[PDB]
Amino acid sequence: TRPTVRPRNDVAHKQLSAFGEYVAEILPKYVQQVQVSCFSELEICIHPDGVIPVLTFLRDHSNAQFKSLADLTAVDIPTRQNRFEIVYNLLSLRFNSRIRVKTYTDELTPVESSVSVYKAANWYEREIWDMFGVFFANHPDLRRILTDYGFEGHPFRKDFPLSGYVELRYDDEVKRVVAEPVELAQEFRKFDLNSPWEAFPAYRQPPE
Amino acid sequence: SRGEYVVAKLDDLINWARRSSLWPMTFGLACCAVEMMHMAAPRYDMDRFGVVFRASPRQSDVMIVAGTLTNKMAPALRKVYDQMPEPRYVVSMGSCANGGGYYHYSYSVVRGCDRIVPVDIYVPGCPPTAEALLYGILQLQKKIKREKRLRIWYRR
Amino acid sequence: TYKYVNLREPSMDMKSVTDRAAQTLLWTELIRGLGMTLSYLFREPATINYPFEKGPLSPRFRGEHALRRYPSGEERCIACKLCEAVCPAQAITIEAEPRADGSRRTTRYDIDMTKCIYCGFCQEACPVDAIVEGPNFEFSTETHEELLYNKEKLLNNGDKWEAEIAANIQADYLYR
Amino acid sequence: PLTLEGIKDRVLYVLKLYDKIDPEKLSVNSHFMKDLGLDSLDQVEIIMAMEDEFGFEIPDIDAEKLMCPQEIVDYIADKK
Amino acid sequence: LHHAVIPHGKGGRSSVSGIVATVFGATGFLGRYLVNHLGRMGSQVIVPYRCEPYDTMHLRPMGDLGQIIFMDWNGRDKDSIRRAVEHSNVVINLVGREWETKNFDFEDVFVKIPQAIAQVSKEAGVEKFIHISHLNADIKSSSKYLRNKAVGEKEVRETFPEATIIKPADIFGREDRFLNYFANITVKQPVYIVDVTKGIINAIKDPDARGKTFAFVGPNRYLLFDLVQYVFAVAHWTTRDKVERIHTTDRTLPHLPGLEDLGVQATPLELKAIEVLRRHRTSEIEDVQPA
Amino acid sequence: TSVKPIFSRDMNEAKRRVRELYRAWYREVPNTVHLFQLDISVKQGRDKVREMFKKNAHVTDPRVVDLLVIKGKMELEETINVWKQRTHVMRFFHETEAPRPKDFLSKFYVGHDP
Ligand SMILES: NC(=O)C1=CN([C@@H]2O[C@H](COP(=O)(O)OP(=O)(O)OC[C@H]3O[C@@H](n4cnc5c(N)ncnc54)[C@H](OP(=O)(O)O)[C@@H]3O)[C@@H](O)[C@H]2O)C=CC1
Ligand code: SF4
Ligand code: SF4
Ligand code: SF4
């Protein structure tokens, strides 16, 4: 098990375990899960109410700074009543440790202007709103970034296909750029590479 | 047919004049812009040919589309293309631009710049070699050698 | 270890301030920059004449998309569809009838040079090394009709040279 | 000069000048929504049309609670 | 019949429609917009150009990938015409210039060209040969242009008699002749270009309307001088042979149907003049309607 | 179960906000259609605007109508600025036929259109 295998270092696993237990004790109110993966980054799964108290606590408090903000995407899965996941990502400048604050939501429940507590989150919030439609409440200015203006449909959803519905060209009748229903020249031959026999027996879900 | 001989040499003169200078504008969105500014480098001079980079669209000669043309880009593209003088010639550089290519199956990619402007010279590559782009400019110049505009105006 | 920049002030010695003021009032280091660019004026220029001297390459350059064949033999492709299975832009279109003499073959083997991103995943994936990237990069096509290759275009492209690809595969049966 | 009957008259002929009501079919105590066939979309059109012609600021709850031409002129007379 | 002449799916931009149109000339105005409606239909335009590659370049990406095809032709030979119409479904004849040249004039183009191409088209097996003509082109005087097109109508009725003779009115569009003639300085009914070319494509794709000649009507039909009033109210090569052609004849011909019998809705002059009349600087809509 | 509401409390403030939004689109059309110099009468533009309001009339929820208020608000802001060019404003219409009537037989001639 030793050569050509990325080694674990369970001392960091224990330290982040103690920190996660510390967090679950000091904020009893909005904690459902504090999980630690074997490659040792913290994940904290959160009810969508106290996200602003969580961020105002974990920006500060002098036991865990976490000034550093990173990615936010509300990674869309079906099959749950709450489809979307706000995935905040944080790094402390002083401590070299990465935590992930994942709170859940569905297609209509917002968060409540998290830009006021992290100033980097402005175009991140506007981006997630434009690409998905996850409305973010009481934000100062929502617009559209990374789409066309006349385009609509919130394309990073699963229901939006690989191509779109509009397609542009230049017509010479009215001498301008117009749109059409999309008309491919090749199929996009979709492959079913879901070959059976369970390459990972560690994650076997139970049946009925 | 001394008039026709004068027409032949005069057509030769103006076609030589058109193919000689050819100062373009670099449209240049993505990494094919980096490749254009690498074929303006010391190891491949456009300036051996008199082909000089110039960001002035009111005096551009060949418009080189290069990069991933999008829906959000395209009205600005043809607004650039309209206010270009009537001698205009189009080089589509890169697999993004000459048929969509790698980002073919998505929203917000016009499947090549054929749907926006007419195209004279397709040159492929992702990225093309700078040396290959220079060769594409040479074959465009041979197209400019083959114009017979003044002959067609003489016998129209 | 941190080796940081600009923690120093111009000291107020009289010679320091008159040398900095001479830099100001007499443009001296500006003229030093002039001397630098004249030192690059008198160099020999590092250009190459293109249409008579083509630029250097490697034996491992990725080019042309030719089909090869056996030594005085049949088509080295088998229509086993791996090149479409790993072609990322999916420019490979394969339809495979078996021929008359029982052996398995093709009908249609197409590349879109518009779509191909020139990785050589098909080069790393063809189990018999049939489709091989060529050496040269000269298409410059006037039409959007011509940039959709068919099987006879690819086989004529493989007919246009072998000894090049012979030397390249002899240079690359050892690493790849 | 700016008196009640002239305000009534000018509201009257701009209702005449509005074209989507066919016929004229004139009634001042009309409740013209149900009886004269007007949707509330046309209602907000007419109320802010008066606002555009010579009206006051005319907020939206006052724009809904009138529904009636004599009552509209009585709202203008409630301010003007 | 053989396959691929059946259409498939929707229409336009690799949505294959079932007609193959060999279009003559078309590097000018009306043939260009007709090519645009065929590419919007998603058809195969076989166009011969006899010109520099640059003008057919500026009309080139109108159709889809390879659905267009370009080839040389001339108004003197025959082998190039037969090489053009090797494998054609339909063919439309639109060629003619409003001014005389050194080598080619009004005569022998309208007298030579439809004879030969109608002959080889009748030989090579086409259907729906659609030939254009001017409105009210007769043997009436002071109009070499109108009498040559009338002789052309007689010849198209002569050889391949099952041909669609069409007669549109004085067209106005984006690149109009006489409106732009007014920009640089007796009723009349002009009709806009997309009404005409929609009528053409509907008459070419709606069979049982074949062999019977068709006429187009401008939906105003008022005086020339009121139109000059309107065009200068909105806007703030000069040979008078053209001015006899635009002063001479303007009438209806009820001997044959028109727009609404074909399946095409008209558009009047005013809205389209608001479209095309730009260039105020760097609305007075009169329309007095004489009969 | 319950839902955090977005902006409104019942359908009434939703109708009030959409009313006001339609007033805003009404005062948005003529100045902008002069400024971009399109080719469409003010009657035709306004009537297709109120047609677009007629398109989504049957929605029975306060949340979705609030979200459409947000949609129309953003689109109205970026049309009242000069960002969305002539292409997109004309793209609101349909100048690409699409003439297809809902006749069973006319859909039956060129077929596979159930
Ligand atoms: N009032 C009018 O004049 C109206 C005219 N029409 C018809 O529309 C058709 C198209 O004309 P339009 O769009 O106005 O513009 P054009 O006059 O430019 O179109 C005529 C076409 O035929 C070509 N052509 C002309 N003479 C010759 C020749 N001798 N040999 C070969 N080709 C020739 C032209 O030039 P090139 O080959 O260089 O491209 C052009 O492509 C004409 O046939 C005309 O009868 C229809 C309605 C109204
Ligand atoms: S063709 Fe390839 S190299 Fe060129 S812009 Fe596209 S991704 Fe970049
Ligand atoms: S991987 Fe090679 S042998 Fe297999 S189908 Fe492709 S070219 Fe043919
Ligand atoms: S080089 Fe890449 S894109 Fe081109 S055919 Fe091979 S795998 Fe496909």
Residue by residue, DSSP assigns A87-99 as EEEEE-TTT--EE
Burial class (CB in 10 A: 0-12, 13-18, 19+), E269: buried
Q: Which two tokens stand for residue A50?
A: 């106290």
**Residues 6 or more apart from B74 whose CB is under 8 A from it?**
A168, A177, B110, B116, F87
Burial class (CB in 10 A: 0-12, 13-18, 19+), E33: buried
**Residues 6 or more apart from C41 whose CB is under 8 A from it?**
none
Residue in C81, B71, A75, C21 with CA at minimum distance from that of residue F87: B71
What's the maximum distance between 2 C-alpha atoms anywhere in chain A?
71
In chain A, beta strands by DSSP E? 31-36, 42-46, 68-70, 84-91, 98-105, 166-171, 176-181
* E29 φ/ψ angles, rounded to the nearest 5 degrees: -95, -65
- CA–CA separation, E94 vs E167, rounded Å? 12
Chain E closest-CA separation from residue C149 CA (Å): 14
- Say which of D19, D39, D52, D78 is annotated catalytic: D39
Q: Any catalytic annotation for residue D78? A: no
In F1-114, beta strands by DSSP E? none
Burial class (CB in 10 A: 0-12, 13-18, 19+), C66: buried
The DSSP letter of residue A114 is G
Long-range contacts, D55-64 (Cβ 8 Å, 24+): D56/D80, D60/F16, D60/F19, D60/F20, D60/F23, D61/F16, D63/F19, D64/D40, D64/F16, D64/F19
Residue in E48, E61, B89, A184 with CA at minimum distance from that of residue C144: E61
**Residues 6 or more apart from E160 whose CB is under 8 A from it?**
E118, E119, E121, E122, E129
Question: Look-up: residue for tokens 């072998």?
Answer: C162
What's the gap in Å between C122 CA and the centre of ligand 4?
6
- CA–CA separation, E31 vs E38, rounded Å? 10
Indicate the top mutation candidate among C65, C75, C80 to test ligand 3's pocket, ranked by most ligand atoms within 8 A of CB: C80
Question: Look-up: residue for tokens 């025959």?
Answer: E78
Q: Is the dihedral of CA C4, C6, C12, C13 positive or negative?
A: positive
- CA–CA separation, C66 vs E90, rounded Å? 40
Residue E147 CA, distance from chain mean position: 18
Are the C-beta atoms of residues E76 and E70 closer than 8 Å to each other? Answer: no
What's the maximum distance between 2 C-alpha atoms anywhere in chain B?
59
Q: Name the closest-CA residue to atom 6, ligand 2.
A: B96
- CA–CA separation, A124 vs A90, rounded Å? 14
Instruction: Specify the resolution in Å.
Output: 4.2
Helix H or strand E segment including A201? none
CA angle D46, D48, D53 (to 5 degrees): 90
Number of domains in chain F: 1
- CA–CA separation, F78 vs E243, rounded Å? 50
**F56 in contact with B, Cβ within 8 Å:** no
- CA–CA separation, A27 vs A3, rounded Å? 42
Are the C-beta atoms of residues E108 and E144 closer than 8 Å to each other? Answer: no
What's the gap in Å between E24 CA and the centre of ligand 1?
9
- CA–CA separation, A68 vs A118, rounded Å? 9
Q: What is the CA radius of gyration of chain D?
A: 12
Going from the C-alpha of A85 to that of each of A45, A48, A103, A162, the distances in angstroms are: 10, 10, 6, 22
- CA–CA separation, B40 vs E36, rounded Å? 39
Partner B, chain F 57-86, Cβ-Cβ below 8 Å: 85-86
Question: Look-up: residue for tokens 């630690």?
Answer: A36
**C144 in contact with E, Cβ within 8 Å:** yes
- CA–CA separation, E212 vs F52, rounded Å? 43
Residue A170 pairs with which residues in a beta bridge? Answer: A177
Question: Look-up: residue for tokens 């609305």?
Answer: E283
Going from the C-alpha of E126 to that of each of E85, E86, E121, E165, the distances in angstroms are: 9, 10, 6, 15
Q: What is the CA radius of gyration of chain F?
A: 18
Going from the C-alpha of E253 to that of each of A63, C109, E136, F60, the distances in angstroms are: 95, 59, 8, 58
Burial class (CB in 10 A: 0-12, 13-18, 19+), F44: middle
- CA–CA separation, C76 vs C128, rounded Å? 7
Q: Which chain C residues contact residue E65 at CB under 8 A?
A: 144-145
* C69 φ/ψ angles, rounded to the nearest 5 degrees: -150, 175
**3 state DSSP class of C113:** coil
Question: Look-up: residue for tokens 């782009």?
Answer: B133
**Residues 6 or more apart from B43 whose CB is under 8 A from it?**
B130, C46, C47, C48, C55
Question: Look-up: residue for tokens 């995407």?
Answer: A73
Amino acid, res. E65:
L
Residue E170 pairs with which residues in a beta bridge? Answer: E190
Are the C-beta atoms of residues E38 and E11 closer than 8 Å to each other? Answer: no
Considering every ligand atom, which ligand is closest to the CA of C63? 4
In chain E, beta strands by DSSP E? 20-23, 44-48, 69-71, 90-93, 130-132, 164-167, 170-172, 187-188, 190-192, 214-215, 222-223
Name the architecture of domain B2-156: 3-Layer(aba) Sandwich (3.40)
Q: Which two tokens stand for residue E61?
A: 């990406």
User: Is ligand 1 within 6 A of the CB of residue E30?
Assistant: yes
Chain A closest-CA separation from residue F75 CA (Å): 8
Q: Which two tokens stand for residue A184?
A: 């491919």
- CA–CA separation, E178 vs A58, rounded Å? 76
Q: Name the closest-CA residue to atom 4, ligand 3.
A: C80
Q: Which two tokens stand for residue C104?
A: 């398995």
Partner E, chain C 145-164, Cβ-Cβ below 8 Å: 145
Asked if F78 and A135 come within 8 Å (Cβ–Cβ), the reply is no
Are the C-beta atoms of residues B62 and C65 closer than 8 Å to each other? Answer: no
Q: Which two tokens stand for residue C81?
A: 């569809």
Tell me the residue range of the domain where C142 lies.
64-175
Q: Which atom of ligand 1 is nearest to the CA of E95?
A: 43
CA dihedral A42, A47, A49, A52 (to 10 degrees): 10
The DSSP letter of residue C75 is B
Beta pairing, strands E69-71 & E44-48: parallel
**3 state DSSP class of C149:** strand
The DSSP letter of residue C44 is P
**Residues 6 or more apart from F84 whose CB is under 8 A from it?**
A149, A150, F78
- CA–CA separation, E4 vs E193, rounded Å? 31
Beta pairing, strands E187-188 & E90-93: unpaired
- CA–CA separation, C130 vs C81, rounded Å? 12
Asked if F90 and A143 come within 8 Å (Cβ–Cβ), the reply is no
**C85 in contact with A, Cβ within 8 Å:** yes
Are the C-beta atoms of residues C95 and C105 closer than 8 Å to each other? Answer: no
Omega into F98 within 30° of 0, i.e. cis? yes
Q: Report the 3 state secondary structure along A27-44.
A: CCCCEEEEEECCCCCEEE
Are the C-beta atoms of residues A84 and A105 closer than 8 Å to each other? Answer: yes
* B80 φ/ψ angles, rounded to the nearest 5 degrees: -65, -40
Residue in E54, E67, E79 with CA at minimum distance from that of residue E23: E67
Q: Which two tokens stand for residue D58?
A: 């005319």
Omega into B127 within 30° of 0, i.e. cis? yes
- CA–CA separation, A173 vs E35, rounded Å? 10
Are the C-beta atoms of residues D29 and D73 closer than 8 Å to each other? Answer: no
Residue in C1, C112, C24 with CA at minimum distance from that of residue C65: C112
Going from the C-alpha of F9 to that of each of A109, A113, B148, the distances in angstroms are: 15, 21, 75
**3 state DSSP class of D38:** coil
Chain F contact partners (≥3 CB pairs within 8 A): A, B, D, E
**Residues 6 or more apart from E199 whose CB is under 8 A from it?**
E168, E214, E216, E259, E262, E264
Q: Which chain B residues contact residue E237 at CB under 8 A?
A: none
* A43 φ/ψ angles, rounded to the nearest 5 degrees: -125, 130
In E81-201, beta strands by DSSP E? 90-93, 130-132, 164-167, 170-172, 187-188, 190-192
- CA–CA separation, C111 vs C101, rounded Å? 27
Residue E8 CA, distance from chain mean position: 28
Torsional class of F8: left (φ above 0), alpha (ψ -120 to 50), beta (otherwise): beta
- CA–CA separation, D63 vs D76, rounded Å? 12
- CA–CA separation, E100 vs C61, rounded Å? 60
Q: Which atom of ligand 4 is nearest to the CA of C123?
A: 6
In C43-124, beta strands by DSSP E? 66-67, 93-95, 108-112
Are the C-beta atoms of residues B29 and B67 closer than 8 Å to each other? Answer: yes
Residue in A16, A21, A101 with CA at minimum distance from that of residue A58: A101
Q: Which site among F82, F83, F87 would you substitute to test the B interface, given the most B Cβ atoms closer than 10 Å to its Cβ? A: F87
- CA–CA separation, D69 vs D61, rounded Å? 16
Question: Look-up: residue for tokens 């099959």?
Answer: A79
Q: Which chain D residues contact residue F27 at CB under 8 A?
A: 48, 52
Name the architecture of domain D6-80: Orthogonal Bundle (1.10)
Residue in B155, B156, B140, B154 with CA at minimum distance from that of residue B62: B140
In B3-79, beta strands by DSSP E? 25-26, 62-66
Indicate the top mutation candidate among B29, B32, B36, B103 to test ligand 2's pocket, ranked by most ligand atoms within 8 A of CB: B32
Are the C-beta atoms of residues A131 and A146 closer than 8 Å to each other? Answer: yes
Helix H or strand E segment including B93? strand B89-93
